Specification:
monomer; 606 residues; alpha/beta; 2 domains; 5-stranded parallel β-sheet; 21 helices; binds a molecule of 2 linked components (U1Y-BGC); binds 2-acetamido-2-deoxy-beta-D-glucopyranose; hydrolase activity, hydrolyzing O-glycosyl compounds; Beta-D-glucan exohydrolase isoenzyme ExoI; Cellulose_Degrad_GH3; Glyco_hydro_3_C_sf; glycosidase
Length: 606
């Protein structure tokens, strides 16, 4: 369709399927296996990208150009890499991926939304969609086109260190929250075929339903372990949200480290090809987890040649290598050269990677929009995050007897108030895992508002606010306080580091609450990624709030404490009496909760 140097795949007016087929038919084996290769930015250089025909890059947790980098620095790094890819013979742009799982959370000054467990408390899919929209703007502000989200794990045991990344133990709440997908990607057309990938264009990102499948169902919530359950139960609990994701055009699926009934997901042809591709009709690309194929064997990495054979024959399309791309390319090349992996398997993987790249507009807009840089940390997104934090909060108790004056809401005007606890003035603690660093971090790691700063911003100017992190009983009894707000809880963690059999918060925590609440009426704010042992915190507290991991906008806590808004959140998980009861989920024969799924006390706006 015109000029003498005309190449169909480069024509933006031709249909995706014709541009894919036109490009695939021109590629060498090296170009094909290049597309199937994702590498860390930490090992990428122009020459590596160009000479290996690399298809994708990622930032893993904490993989950043430097500490405190601006949105423009991120854009320049991504463009740098993309310039190299676009200089290859075929000019195939790379897709850059990142864990934007509660905002663009590796980026300094990015808005940090509550983690998924808290969003589950909101029962507000439309709020989660809005979070998806804001996240896509903030990811595109940094030049990135691909978010590894959403986690549609169904956590069935809160000893799992990723329990906070699950919206709920109820598959129905996880299904409702797949509205994240059309937030990140855009709404699919009215006509849409379930399983086709979709991204609206340069102001949206590709999404990733992960981790397929049963990441939330491991024995003793041990991260990466064995999910022991029959076909009926995998299909009734862990699968359904994958179908919702297909209907909303999720562009990719990341495979789980976990096994189903002793079979590595990363080697499971029946589930990856039989079910996801041939039954659910997935037409996007399937990506590995991080060294996922390496972990097929025991030990991990002890037969990479197997790892490649088993993972690629199971139907995986793109491999998050992510460092040793030379070994990955050499070994897949040999298996194809020896007839062990047929060319048709390579062509199907490359067809799906190119389908996603063409669909999402990457060949038309391979470079970053410098005008999107101001989207990062935009006050409108913060206001959204604040709304979400507030709606996430679950009021567990509001008066020590039925007869007491309810403590909440608190008055903004009082002569003197106490704000206390390890978590009252710690932005890192309130964001948790996957914030600036992989495992999250302590203190003032990014832009935000702690509980202490929110209280000072909220109260009447005549109200004297005293901060003491760990005050003793005498300090409180002598200080002349009207009331105390005390904030304690879990430290930041992710995945295996947060696997935890006893689920009790670190000291000082209980001690500071007992010391404070012993001397003056107290509202306790519990910062956690999951239910933890709570009876002793309750027994001491006049009121207690489960705030989960509310993110950067701490004023969402104070919006409810002080009666600007009523408490509306409902537990999206069972709150246990004792860890010995676990696993224990809404529905089981032997169901004895401290607080059932769906519990939450209410208040009214003053
Ligand atoms: C992420 O940085 C490196 O991360 C892994 C955590 S694992 C895996 O990472 C994927 C890509 O970041 C995520 O999308 C996925 O949900 C996770 O399961 C860790 O092993 C490395 O030590 C860390 O450097
Ligand atoms: C589960 O964890 C144990 C150790 O805690 C490990 O040795 C075993 O191989 C794991 N099982 C699976 C199938 O991943
Ligand atoms: C409980 O488990 C965690 C993680 O394994 C551990 O760090 C913590 O010290 C333990 N707590 C108690 C009370 O033993
Ligand atoms: C809160 O408002 C509800 C809804 O009308 C009402 O039933 C309840 O009595 C109110 N409680 C307080 C403490 O104002």
């Amino acid at each position: 369709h015109h000029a003498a140097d005309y190449v169909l795949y480069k024509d933006a007016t031709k249909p995706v399927e014709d541009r894919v087929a036109d490009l695939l038919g021109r590629m060498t084996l090296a170009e094909k296996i290049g597309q199937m290769t994702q590498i860390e930015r930490l090992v990428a250089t122009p020459d590596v990208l160009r000479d290996n025909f690399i298809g994708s890059l990622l930032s893993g947790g904490g993989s950043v150009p430097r500490k405190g980098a601006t949105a423009k620095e991120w854009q320049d790094m991504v463009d740098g890499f993309q310039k190299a890819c676009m200089s290859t013979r075929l000019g195939i742009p790379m897709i850059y991926g990142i864990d934007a799982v509660h905002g663009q959370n590796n980026v300094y000054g990015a808005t940090i939304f509550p983690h998924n467990v808290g969003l589950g408390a909101t029962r507000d899919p439309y709020l989660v969609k809005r979070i998806g929209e804001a996240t896509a703007l903030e990811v595109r502000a940094t030049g990135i086109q691909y978010a590894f989200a959403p986690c549609i794990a169904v956590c069935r045991d809160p000893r799992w260190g990723a329990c906070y990344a699950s919206y709920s133990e109820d598959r129905r709440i996880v299904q409702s929250m797949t509205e994240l997908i059309p937030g990140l990607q855009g709404d699919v057309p009215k006509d849409f075929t379930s399983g086709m990938p979709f991204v609206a264009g340069k102001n949206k990102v590709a999404a990733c339903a992960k981790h397929f499948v049963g990441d939330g169902g491991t024995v003793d919530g041990i991260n990466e372990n064995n999910t022991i359950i029959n076909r009926e139960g995998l299909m009734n609990i862990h699968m359904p949200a994958y179908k919702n994701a297909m209907d909303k055009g999720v562009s990719t699926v990341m495979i789980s480290y976990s096994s189903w009934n002793g079979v590595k997901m990363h080697a499971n042809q029946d589930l990856v090809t039989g079910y996801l591709k041939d039954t659910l009709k997935f037409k996007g690309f399937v990506i590995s987890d991080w060294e996922g194929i390496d972990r097929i064997t025991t030990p991990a990495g002890s037969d990479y040649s197997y790892s490649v054979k088993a993972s690629i024959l199971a139907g995986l399309d793109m491999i998050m290598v992510p460092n040793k791309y030379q070994q990955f390319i050499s070994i897949l090349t040999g298996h194809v050269n020896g007839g062990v992996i047929p060319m048709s398997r390579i062509d199907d993987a490359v067809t799906r990677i190119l389908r996603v790249k063409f669909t999402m507009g990457l060949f038309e807009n391979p470079y970053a929009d410098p005008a999107m840089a101001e989207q990062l940390g935009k006050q409108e997104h913060r206001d959204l995050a604040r709304e979400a934090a507030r709606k996430s909060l679950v009021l567990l108790k509001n008066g020590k007897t039925s007869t007491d004056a309810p403590l909440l809401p608190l008055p903004k005007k009082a002569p003197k108030i106490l704000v206390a606890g390890s978590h009252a003035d710690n932005l890192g603690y309130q964001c948790g895992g996957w914030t600036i660093e992989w495992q999250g971090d302590t203190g003032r790691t990014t832009v935000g508002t702690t509980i202490l700063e929110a209280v000072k911003a909220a109260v009447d100017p005549s109200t004297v606010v005293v901060f003491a992190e760990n005050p003793d009983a005498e300090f409180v009894k002598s200080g002349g306080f009207s009331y105390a707000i005390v904030a304690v809880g879990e430290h930041p963690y992710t995945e295996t580091k947060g696997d935890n059999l006893n689920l009790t918060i670190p000291e000082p925590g209980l001690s500071t609450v007992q010391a404070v609440c012993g001397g003056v009426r107290c509202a306790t704010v519990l910062i956690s990624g999951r239910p933890v042992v709570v009876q002793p915190l309750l027994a001491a507290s006049d009121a207690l709030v489960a705030a989960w991991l509310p993110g950067s906008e701490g004023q969402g806590v104070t919006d409810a404490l002080f009666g600007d808004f009523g408490f509306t959140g409902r537990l999206p998980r069972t709150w246990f009496k004792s860890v010995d009861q676990l696993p224990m989920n809404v529905g089981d024969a032997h169901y004895d909760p401290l607080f059932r799924l769906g519990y939450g006390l209410t208040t009214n706006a003053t």
